[PDB]
Design a protein around this ligand. Sequence first.
Ligand code: MTA
Ligand code: MTA
Ligand code: MTA
Ligand code: MTA
Lengths: 312, 313, 313, 312
Amino acid sequence: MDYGMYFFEHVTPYETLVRRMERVIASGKTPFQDYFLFESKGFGKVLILDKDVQSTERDEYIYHETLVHPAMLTHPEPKRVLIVGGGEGATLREVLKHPTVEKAVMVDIDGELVEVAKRHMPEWHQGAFDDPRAVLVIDDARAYLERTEERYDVVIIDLTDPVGEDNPARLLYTVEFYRLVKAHLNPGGVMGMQAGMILLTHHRVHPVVHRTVREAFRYVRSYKNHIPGFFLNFGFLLASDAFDPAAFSEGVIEARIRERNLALRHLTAPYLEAMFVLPKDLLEALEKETMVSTDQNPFYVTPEGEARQAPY
Amino acid sequence: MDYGMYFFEHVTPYETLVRRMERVIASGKTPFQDYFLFESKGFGKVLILDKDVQSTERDEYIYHETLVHPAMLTHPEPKRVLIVGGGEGATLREVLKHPTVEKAVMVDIDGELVEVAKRHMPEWHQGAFDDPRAVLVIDDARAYLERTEERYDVVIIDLTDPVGEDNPARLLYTVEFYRLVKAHLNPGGVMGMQAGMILLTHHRVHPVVHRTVREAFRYVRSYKNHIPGFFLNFGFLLASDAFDPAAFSEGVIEARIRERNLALRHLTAPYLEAMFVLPKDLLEALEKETMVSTDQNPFYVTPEGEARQAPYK
Amino acid sequence: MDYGMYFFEHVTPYETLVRRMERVIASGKTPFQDYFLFESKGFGKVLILDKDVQSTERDEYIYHETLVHPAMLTHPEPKRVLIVGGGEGATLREVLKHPTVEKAVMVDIDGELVEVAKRHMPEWHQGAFDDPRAVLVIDDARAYLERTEERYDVVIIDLTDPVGEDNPARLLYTVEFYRLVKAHLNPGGVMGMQAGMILLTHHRVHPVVHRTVREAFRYVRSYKNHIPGFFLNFGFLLASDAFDPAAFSEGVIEARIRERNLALRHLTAPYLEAMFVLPKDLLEALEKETMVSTDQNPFYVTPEGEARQAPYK
Amino acid sequence: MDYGMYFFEHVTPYETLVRRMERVIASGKTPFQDYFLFESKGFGKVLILDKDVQSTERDEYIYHETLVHPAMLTHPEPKRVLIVGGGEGATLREVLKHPTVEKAVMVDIDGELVEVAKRHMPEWHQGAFDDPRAVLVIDDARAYLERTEERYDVVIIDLTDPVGEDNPARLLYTVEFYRLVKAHLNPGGVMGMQAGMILLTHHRVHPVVHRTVREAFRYVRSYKNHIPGFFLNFGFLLASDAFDPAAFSEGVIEARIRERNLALRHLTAPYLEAMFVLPKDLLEALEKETMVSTDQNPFYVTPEGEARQAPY
Ligand SMILES: CSC[C@H]1O[C@@H](n2cnc3c(N)ncnc32)[C@H](O)[C@@H]1O
Ligand SMILES: CSC[C@H]1O[C@@H](n2cnc3c(N)ncnc32)[C@H](O)[C@@H]1O
Ligand SMILES: CSC[C@H]1O[C@@H](n2cnc3c(N)ncnc32)[C@H](O)[C@@H]1O
Ligand SMILES: CSC[C@H]1O[C@@H](n2cnc3c(N)ncnc32)[C@H](O)[C@@H]1O
């Protein structure tokens, strides 16, 4: 391809995405991770955290819609919402889009990266932060969830795979963490989350996530969607003790979409319910999975993609 | 990211996929294309044509299941199948998987490539090529179905995005070609084919392949699925002049699976039928596409990776 | 090999140098070229023009020492210097290092680039540009020395390999151009210039630049040296109509160094004079080169990276 | 650049050479290193060992000439020669080119790679092996030199940088190793060697080599030359107790070149003596160097290029 500036995105240990930069808007170091924000011609601005794309501007709508709305849509009347992780302000954006929302609290360990999302990714946050109903909190979720005891109707979890042994994002993907999410939910409340890529042909982050969350939640329902941006099939899930969040009654998602006036660009009612219908190979793997990650023994993925587990 | 052998695989003009080569198994230069077959730790053997990967081992089951059986399961008792393209002949193996089938004519320019597939790609063909029902034909499929009056229930067009001005195979991408295909159908007959990546920010290959086909059949149904080893969302479609191929029942597709003892590894009735549920953006992209392609001005793929029309040189 | 930002730097058509970008400092697109200045751990700030690196910080001292002082030290008391090209103005700083010098006219298309150098490349220019002896001229150096009757003792041609058919700067690579240069010399006067990589298996840029110049001066001496940050063997030369610029004494070059209190960091009298000792292969390549380039058929660099002649469009 | 097969050659930690392969002649694993032999269009066949180019076919003549002949030329009458390392059979080739040679013994730890040089690099060895005067020995040099006690007029050392901590090529770049080379030399004998790249702008393999060899040899003279193949300025040296191997008398290298009938393609007499005249920056660094690598404390280069030293 053309010669010039490029970014070597890791993807899998055998497949690297080399992606053209037209211009480096911003790049640096926080006390928690590396960022690069550059100008893709294809997807506009792109944001790497560490060695992995985080979002792209022209496609983020697909990911943010797919992460939020299936959880909000699947709750009858979402009033208080917690967003764990998710610093660009887009999860916020789509959460704020539901009018039954009075409060939306967003937590996220890394200030300067938010400060970066704000200075340089207006396209994302879109004003979000400065909405009255919002409350930025810069802490570690596990810390936040242990100290406060406010409760929520939906929690959205938008965190970063727990990759490699040393990583401390690991103590966020244990069952203890999810009972801890659970501990903070009203009755009728639902959890929503990104759970890692599916490429089940290498590997296993998605199904262990599903299995582990299963140990804290009665009803765990796993859905999927292609983020073009990532060139990758991403796994998400919905969880609840209170009811099966994917028994979708005829006409109802659509009902709510109207009442609520959702400006949507990717999702429609039937597409949304489609995300939930999985190929057989995804079913089988989701079923074969037995690893449950625990505080005692937190799971991580090898840099070969394999699921390991040991103390921290 | 190591050192060692890598492939450099075009994905669009701004994203390139660098793949780690465990060992080249065979490359060379047929009079119709460049090819590299190699061994990766990720997807088993990988196959490249010019700058793109035709197919991967660990995951071609998916692409092929997706391509074929829609079209096949939507036909109530298919007997005569045209497979245009598909050197590998996994396209054949999936087809030869339906009982009903008496004769499947595989038609493909590049028998030297087909030979590689034979010699090196067992994993794909799985004897498909020596089925007493297969007719290997070694010609430009446009010459063939023009040079014959033979009839079919299902065509399956397993071709390849037709890149660049200079290419006799942009002629496989026009409403006169899809008409040729149409003319060569039985009364119940359905086409089903592959129709490009879906990557709405770089280009409109899929929509335009779809627009081209809306022009030569009543009913055009796009479906798509995610092919892991491509790292792409691929776009497919079905077209027929008879029924809407998309308004099936889900009870019936199930019927015909269990019925014809299809071994499936990816598809299920539910999943299959869902592939046909498109998100708002993509339905618009389709309902908004205009460019139809014709022998007169065929469309090719710009090396900026978008749809363009221009007259026939 | 990590992840992070990389440059992709053309070296030939089959070797590419991927350089790790610590931080882009400034890129953009002047009406004459693309440019990227960035920060690497290896060589400090790196500067790219189109697909090649003009210069590196930790090691430009070398390229510049090598370019300039030969030519300068071979002239017994240089006063008036033409510097064609050399945006960075390290070419200036080295020149402005000789006492004898009264006036150095730097002449260079692209003042926007020169501005980058000013704003971002202090390390290079080192005030060179504000020497009461420097005349920044912002024109096509071919227009300039054609549009003037001014005279010089040393010219120094710090241009750039002239790649591709379309380029008004292939006109800076002909015997009519080097004659223009000649015509604009004093009686003792010497040219010295940069003359391409030396990479005898891919191409004959150096020999051909040399052959072109043999045509417009009596005495042509190739010398070369290894520029680390390029990972290339670069080729240079001196030409004069007066003496052989190559038959110096080594006692004398030493004289003139100590004499003019040249701070040197790379060159020494011995080393400098040795750059002029070529191996068998390279002397043949030179004695075997034929292609001369002319306004009539100027030579450009093929994107297969070899010398080609073709008439003026 | 074009799309297709490529090889990612390491070079420096900040600069990688990505080099086009037209065809993979051969590649595999020995019990000691990795090989890849491929078809460059530029340089013809190329041979990687591990992650580093070893030779290229159209340019090897430059490297092999530059490694051998300055040592052989600088000996009055070279009869017995030892070549440590150097498995392609090219050092052999040029050593055999001097007619005063009756025996030439070549040692090299890795059989299968020789077996590979023979099956697939005819261009290199050129018959070499099958010359009567030659004697292939497949051992570790240090082992070979400790067991036998034959002696030699020139030793050529053509080994592979000692790179990274775990590497066992390290015990080959100590002073004890060179006293051990020395221990095996007739009087009037000279050592010749590749000593690593010069890029003194990163780093230091060349000057420590020079300094260490200096501790076993009275006269160590360091010369250099650009191998196009490697895109890199490579450092070599000549050593002797018996006399200054780079006091070059007027007309003498040339004298010997004639008498001996050297078919040379790169070197000439004056070029050969030129290699010995170094830039100031190379002089200064050669002089500032103080690290001497020892059995007790073997030196290696960091993967950042820095010279370290500790026990093994
Ligand atoms: C990168 S995906 C997600 C976002 O969640 C953030 N994040 C990572 N770890 C935590 C944590 N322990 N608590 C809250 N947010 C986190 C990261 O800064 C990023 O902005
Ligand atoms: C590998 S998927 C592809 C197949 O489509 C084949 N193909 C390419 N062009 C044509 C054509 N004009 N007619 C039939 N098959 C073709 C390729 O040769 C390959 O076999
Ligand atoms: C950076 S080394 C190079 C310099 O030569 C300059 N250059 C390129 N073309 C011309 C030309 N036709 N006349 C004068 N200088 C030029 C470039 O603009 C750069 O300043
Ligand atoms: C790669 S540069 C040099 C050659 O010397 C060889 N070599 C490496 N270590 C030793 C050793 N201890 N003794 C002899 N030869 C070696 C390598 O196999 C290679 O062929």
